[PDB]
Amino acid sequence: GLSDGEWQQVLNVWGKVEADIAGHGQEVLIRLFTGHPETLEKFDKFKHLKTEAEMKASEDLKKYGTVVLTALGGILKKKGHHEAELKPLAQSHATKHKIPIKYLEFISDAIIHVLHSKHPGDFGADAQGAMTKALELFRNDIAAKYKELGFQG
Least separation in angstroms between CB 119 and ligand HEM: 19
3-state secondary structure the chain: CCCHHHHHHHHHHHHHHHCCHHHHHHHHHHHHHHHCCCHHHHCCCCCCCCCCHHHHCCCHHHHHHHHHHHHHHHHHCCCCCCHHHHHHHHHHHHHHCCCCCCHHHHHHHHHHHHHHHHCCCCCCHHHHHHHHHHHHHHHHHHHHHHHHCCCCC
Least separation in angstroms between CB 93 and ligand HEM: 6
Least separation in angstroms between CB 121 and ligand HEM: 25
Rank residues 5 and 95 by Cβ distance to ligand HEM and give the closer one.
95
Rank residues 69 and 127 by Cβ distance to ligand HEM and give the closer one.
69
Rank residues 7 and 43 by Cβ distance to ligand HEM and give the closer one.
43
Rank residues 9 and 65 by Cβ distance to ligand HEM and give the closer one.
65
Binding region for ligand HEM (CB under 6 A): 39, 42-45, 67-68, 71-72, 89, 92, 97, 99, 103-104, 107
